[PDB]
Structure 1
Amino acid sequence: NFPNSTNLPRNPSMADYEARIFTFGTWIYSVNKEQLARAGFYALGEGDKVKCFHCGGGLTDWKPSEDPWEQHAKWYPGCKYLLEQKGQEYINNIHLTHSLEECLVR
């Protein structure tokens, strides 16, 4: 249940962009499948459910406003694919953003 924060991926079968792209197939949900594959995610085949090949972290119910890489950071901040690809400079923006997002509206 806990997410992988090691530097080795949990599903190395899904480590190649093409392997991940194939899992979606015809994809009808609001959020783009190339965008999701680039962000590490492959598809389960149960609705819009996706999983990061590295952290194992899963997400669902994608709104059009929700960005793969942004959601990757929100829920799986320990991911090492995330850190390798966007780098803690970016990752900290999201979190301040996402915390500050909540203080305004309340």
Structure 2
Amino acid sequence: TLPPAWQPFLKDHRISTFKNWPFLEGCACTPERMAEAGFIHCPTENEPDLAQCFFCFYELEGWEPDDDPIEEHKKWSSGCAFLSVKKQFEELTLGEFLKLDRERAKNKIAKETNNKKKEFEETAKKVRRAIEQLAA
């Protein structure tokens, strides 16, 4: 039945993530071609526009009707391995797949360590200002 943690690899799943998504028929970035680029619908309130790649975890917003999801992706985060995947999911070898899933887990790690870093940087700046202000 396929495990839930590994669904994002399934296009139909990615497509399904798009609920109340604008840009349909007549538009270049349809949920079909969004999922084709590896994108998921992760809409907030402050940006119901938000889509994120399931593999690299890059995030894009402000989508234009004429935007080509693949082209948008290649330019911003080219390093994403998924882009290089030309085979149908069901035509992937178990090894190939486990190799990919491995790299995904990796990318997810990198993402969160980056956020932990920015968070820490900010807190550091605040604390630094506070003590500085106390001088005087």
Corresponding position: 1:35 with 2:33: yes
Instruction: Could you list the structure 1 runs, at least 4 aligned residues long, displaced by more than 6 angstroms after superposition.
Output: none
Please give the TM-score of this superposition, normalised by the length of structure 2. Answer: 0.50
2:63 aligns with 62
Q: What's the TM-score, normalizing by structure 1?
A: 0.63
Structure 2: give runs of 5+ residues left out of the alignment: 87-136
Residue 23 of structure 1: CA displacement?
1.0
The Cα of 1:66 is off from its aligned counterpart by 1.5
Q: Decide whether the 8 Å contact of 1:41 with 1:53 is kept in 2.
A: yes
Comparing both structures, which one devotes a greater share of its residues to helix?
2
- Structure ranking higher on relative contact order (CA contacts 8 Å, 6+ apart): 1
User: May I ask how many residue pairs the two structures share in their alignment?
Assistant: 76
In structure 1, the gaps of 5 or more residues are: 1-10, 86-106
Identity among equivalent pairs (%)? 35
Q: CA RMSD in A?
A: 2.0
Q: Which amino acid aligns with 1:40?
A: G
Which structure has the bigger radius of gyration? 2
Q: Which residue in the other structure is 2:43 paired with? A: 45
